[PDB]
């Protein structure tokens with residue numbers, strides 16, 4: 001009854017106070033269901049650019065809320081838990097970027113969107129899981145600096161044939177460290193299922209999958225693949241999203257994988273956020289201006 005109370009009050013306050021709710025794919029299902037749009041980080045930031053509303057309640061982690069703010073600088077962006085963050089992103093530092101630029105000055109700095117806003121001010125181009133191959137393909141250089149995810153960087157090297165210098169050392173997402181034995185098991189249990197895993201997964205997992213793709217790419221695979229069962233190698237929130245879009249398919253987690261930071265957002269603190277209209281995401285004007293440069297370069301490459 002309190003969830004119904006909270007859901008009803010959340011819906012009431014968002015209309016009353018003029019908020020659009022954007023939720024990342026990895027939010028708990030109860031928050032996905034009250035959001036106006038559910039998607040990946042860049043998808044939500046670009047969706048916000050289209051909106052006539054000027055107030056956004058963002059449900060994800062801090063670098064994503066900040067990406068919304070960078071591309072929507074004149075909108076008020078609030079989050080329910082100001083400590084929700086990406087530990088992988090936080091392991092890459094300005095000092096490491098500057099060190100590697102000095103070592104490899106002819107190598108463009110390609111930063112995965114899962115990166116701090118401060119790191120973005122130092123990057124030559126931003127990329128996402130879905131466009132990293134195309135972005136690195138179109139760059140002039142046969143060598144790039146790439147971070148913060150080593151698995152994604154090595155996947156890009158495989159697909160482009162280019163040299164990819166990854167930073168920091170052992171940059172990785174703990175959520176996507178499935179083991180390849182999980183794929184061996186599902187091949188036995190569901191011999192006709194299609195296995196889709198994220199490019200942030202380790203190479204033995206990527207190489208055993210039917211598809212490697214971002215969450216956005218996962219959402220599009222059943223549009224062209226009629227298989228009845230998909231096994232999904234990413235954070236558990238995506239199962240809810242996929243089942244909602246394709247109710248006549250079955251979606252099976254490769255393993256249970258939970259991002260603790262994504263789960264910091266709850267109905268209760270989401271309600272608190274609408275009641276208090278906090279916590280506002282604020283970036284210095286200078287950070288927004290500098291971080292926009294590699295984001296626009298990414299838009300330009302994607303043509």
Ligand code: SF4
Nearest residue numbers: 086087114173175259
């Ligand atoms: S799922 Fe991994 S990459 Fe995404 S926010 Fe959580 S820790 Fe960071």
Ligand SMILES: [Cl-]
Nearest residue numbers: 072073074075
């Ligand atoms: Cl704006």
Ligand SMILES: [Cl-]
Nearest residue numbers: 026041086114
């Ligand atoms: Cl993520």
